[PDB]
Amino acid sequence: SALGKLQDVVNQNAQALNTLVKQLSSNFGAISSVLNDILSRLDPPEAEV
C-alpha cells in the first residue's frame, strides 16, 4: 500500500484504456456495434448513416 500513489496512476490509465476499448462494443443508436457487419448487410445509402 505504501506505493499507492504510483499504482493508482497505472490503474487510472488502465481504466481509461479499458473503458475506451469497451466503447467499441456499443451501438450509439446504430443497428450494430460492428462495422463490417453493417457493410455486409446494408448498401452505402444507409450504412453511411
Binding site: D43, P44, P45, E46, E48
Partner: protein
C-alpha cells in the same frame, strides 16, 4: 434526362431506390442534386390495343 415509365415506377426515380428501373434502366446517385419531374401521359403514350 427524359424518358417514360409506368406510374408505380415513378417512386424508383430517386436516390437510394431499388427495382427494375433503378437497377437496369436509370439509376440516380445517392448524392443527387437536382429535380425530378413526372406527369401522366396516358392521353399521349397509350392507345386502344
Amino acid at each position: 434526362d427524359s424518358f417514360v415509365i409506368r406510374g408505380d415506377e415513378v417512386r424508383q426515380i430517386a436516390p437510394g431506390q431499388t427495382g427494375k428501373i433503378a437497377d437496369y434502366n436509370y439509376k440516380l446517385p445517392d448524392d443527387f442534386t437536382g429535380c425530378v419531374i413526372a406527369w401522366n401521359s396516358n392521353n399521349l403514350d397509350s392507345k386502344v390495343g
